[PDB]
Amino acid sequence: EYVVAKLDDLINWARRSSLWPMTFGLACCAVEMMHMAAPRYDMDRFGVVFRASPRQSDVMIVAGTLTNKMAPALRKVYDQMPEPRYVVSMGSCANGGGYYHYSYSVVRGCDRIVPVDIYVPGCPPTAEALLYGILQLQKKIKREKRL
């Protein structure tokens, strides 16, 4: 009744505590994604530990432009993730092409390939604005399993 309701929040507290990102070296957004590891604006053991390998991680951050050559590649990586998974599409390329969009190769918005939970709009995604991409992620995890 009360113990059951608090135990579900305790499991959700583990995702609120720590989430491991994926080092998607996809574009210029990946350089600012490296700035999350940079000391001045840090999530290093604040709630983020870089390790790579899609099998171990909990959150994958799509960091830039995706093309038709990359659409089969990213899709199965998301499938290689453990079932409690979150996708953060960071940048205008990740939201529907920086420019592009009306281009031949670029797939529009990532959502055509892989579903996204948290959007970051910033081209040069400022590390200040990037910090929401992990903090809002933890805030969005509220309730899991009622019955």
């Binding site: 305790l10 499991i11 507290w13 583990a14 995702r15 505590s17 720590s18 000391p39 840090d42 290093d44 053991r45 604040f46 709630g47 530990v49 390790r51 790579a52 390998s53 099998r55 171990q56 909990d58 453990p82 079932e83 409690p84």
Partner: protein
């Protein structure tokens, strides 16, 4: 028996609380703040990973293998945590008839954890990280036994209980001056968080015994791989350190033994951050080509010494 159960549960916590040090000390080495948000100083984060990786994370490999693969994290913990038993400490759990023989045999048996993870995935991508892990360990098992023999002939027999009593006035670092420097390198034979290390970390290649494993088996691998780092740190603090014995007061020994080990516990993470990987080919050239003739020359030297001046247990 209560002692064994009082040497797994608090020991798994020491491997858990290692994750703090793995990014706190390593963090300040790189001038960055580590654990801070979760606890008072991030102290609630290491215990949070046990709730994170086991209860919610579900993966099993695709093409896989049969019984093997899931057999490997059982082989990871069930051979590396057993290493705590022959340890002399203030008082050992079942003091062995010969001490260090069980320590050397089970350490080589602990290598199989990264070996059976090669056949975890039938695909060839995972076994490259396994084949690299063979040579990065197979060569360093030669000197690991030889440098032991030079220390063991200097002081007592194979029994780990005699190694505490032999250091009453001075440490074994000073007589075994080049041999002590070797045990900062030879200890990193097993896949440990280091600069020398083995095929386990990412950097250049895919992560060995991690790309095939999930989260749950993969989480169980870290509870064994980082456990070996403490094990080598304690083992160096027996063979080379000692300071005092005192059988009457165990309290004076337990505090003094931990400080000596903790200074070495920081030293491996000091190595990890500082230096790049030695390469697959060139690590085979550090030892064998260059260090093996040096260790055998010191082994030749340590045979003559008890004959030159009386030194027999």
């Amino acid at each position: 028996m209560i002692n064994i159960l009082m040497l797994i549960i608090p020991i798994l916590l020491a491997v858990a609380f290692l994750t703090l040090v793995e990014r706190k000390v390593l963090g300040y080495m790189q001038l960055r703040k580590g654990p801070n948000v979760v606890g008072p100083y991030g102290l609630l984060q290491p215990i949070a990973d046990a709730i994170k990786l086991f209860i919610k994370e579900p993966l099993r490999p695709a093409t896989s293998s049969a019984s093997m693969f899931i057999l490997a994290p059982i082989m990871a913990l069930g051979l590396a945590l057993t290493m705590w038993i022959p340890l002399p400490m203030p008082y050992p759990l079942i003091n062995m008839n010969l001490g260090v023989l069980f320590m050397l045999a089970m350490s080589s048996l602990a290598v199989y954890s990264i070996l059976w993870s090669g056949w975890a995935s039938n695909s060839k991508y995972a076994l490259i990280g396994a084949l690299r892990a063979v040579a990065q360990t197979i060569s360093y098992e030669v000197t690991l036994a030889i440098i032991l023999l030079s220390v063991l002939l200097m002081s007592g027999s194979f029994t780990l209980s005699t190694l505490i009593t032999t250091q009453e006035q001075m440490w074994l670092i000073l007589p075994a001056w080049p041999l002590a420097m070797m045990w900062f390198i030879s200890t990193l034979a097993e896949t440990n968080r280091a600069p020398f290390d083995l095929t386990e970390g990412e950097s250049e290649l895919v992560s060995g015994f991690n790309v095939e494993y999930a989260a749950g088996p993969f989480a169980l691998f870290f509870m064994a791989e980082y456990a070996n780092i403490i094990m080598m740190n304690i083992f160096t603090a027996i063979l080379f350190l000692g300071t005092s014995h005192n059988p009457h007061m165990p309290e004076l020994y337990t505090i003094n033994f931990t400080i000596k080990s903790l200074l070495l516990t920081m030293s491996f993470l000091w190595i990890r951050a500082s230096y790049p990987r030695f390469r697959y080919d060139q690590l085979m050239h550090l030892l064998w080509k260059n260090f093996l003739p040096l260790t055998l020359a010191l082994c030749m030297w340590h045979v003559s010494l008890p004959i030159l001046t009386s030194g027999i247990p």
